[PDB]
């Protein structure tokens, strides 16, 4: 569609800035960006096809990385097509994850993880909207970055709330439901505070103690 | 057995964390390096689950790792550049384990063999990427190896077309280009810079790409 179009024509004009830049790292720099814009293209294909209230931010997503890819075609320094590429990239990823949510949470049945998804897209689609509403790259960066580990932070609340359902050992069954319960006031704590910086905070707490218990419930 | 890098990376994430409490957008800037360094963590569990010639350059790979994160503990913005060299090589070992399931499962001779070439290839970027002492010198290695697997999973799926392709125009299409993509890998070859390597690739699938975007 016009995507491949943008960024096939993005490309050799990359291309073509590092055949007559002759500089050591700025010539991989500049092909780093188109190998970049590649893999996004290959990403954007593949996220087209694959609860209609998910497909509504999946436009919001694909419009927004389209605004990027629009931008980039519209400016010259390759420092900004930088940055504009990898804000794109984390769209590419945060659309990924939010449809290894989608499949999560209709093959879920405890209602505490089906009332966490609600608060976690909740949060996601304010951020999501102050970043179409913002004009610095890294700004919507930021703020699609915190939305990226809340879906991941969501998809580990569902691993271990599977966890805790079939655990035998019961230490790990007492520290699992202890770890979630921590999660849920971190998400909670994440809704009550606007500050993006404080989100990430909450989230980078709530991992760390996930996966101390992911590493020490790991099959040797 | 191999998991002391999660108590390393725990001990800089937590490092990490108590910098930022105690710290505007410098607390995000900080912040992210922990996020990265857990995804890191992450992909060790990922690789904990899943032929020796794959679980000897699991070894380099991880030795490697480890050897970036014992610097990042030695070391005070750089950590930034050191984890996702860490995370370049991850993502490295994550596709050498998918390869090596789609080049088990093969039976063309002429996958084959440019597998065995662009392994070769990649095999002199891991050994340099070992021997090399600054860490962008390491990515720009791992990078052109990245990319170079990638190429060979296109390499992989574009023979699968061209075998199961019922469109005769379509199956004459797909042997061109990789016969094109052919002669591209022989250049790569031929070239020891990896920025030069690293053109011939993004020169490879941009006629990779065009086809498979046409083909519905």
């Not at 943008?6 to 830049?21: D, F, G, I, N, Y």
């Not at 890294?138 to 966890?163: D, G, N, P, S, W």
């Not at 921590?182 to 996966?211: F, S, T």
Request: aromatic fraction near 6%.
């Amino acid at each position: 569609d016009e995507l491949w179009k943008r960024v096939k024509k993005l490309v050799t004009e990359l291309l073509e800035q590092a055949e007559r830049a002759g500089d050591p790292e700025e010539i991989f720099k500049l092909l780093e960006v188109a190998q970049q814009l590649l893999w996004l293209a290959e990403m954007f294909l593949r996220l087209a096809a694959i609860d209609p209230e998910i497909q509504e931010l999946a436009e919001r997503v694909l419009r927004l990385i389209k605004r990027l890819l629009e931008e980039a075609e519209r400016a010259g320094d390759p420092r900004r097509i930088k940055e504009l590429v990898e804000v794109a990239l984390a769209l590419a990823k945060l659309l990924e994850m939010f449809y290894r949510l989608k499949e999560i949470q209709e093959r879920a049945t405890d209602p505490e993880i089906q009332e966490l998804a609600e608060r976690v897209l909740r949060l996601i689609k304010k951020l999501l909207k102050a970043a179409e509403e913002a004009g610095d790259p890294r700004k919507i960066y930021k703020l699609v970055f915190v939305a990226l580990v809340l879906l991941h932070l969501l998809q580990t609340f569902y691993r271990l709330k599977e966890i805790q359902e079939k655990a035998t050992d019961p230490e790990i069954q007492r520290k699992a439901q202890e770890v979630l319960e921590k999660i849920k006031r971190l998400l909670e704590a994440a809704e009550r505070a606007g500050d993006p910086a404080k989100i990430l905070l909450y989230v980078i707490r709530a991992q760390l103690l996930a996966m101390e218990l992911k590493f020490a419930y790991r099959k040797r």
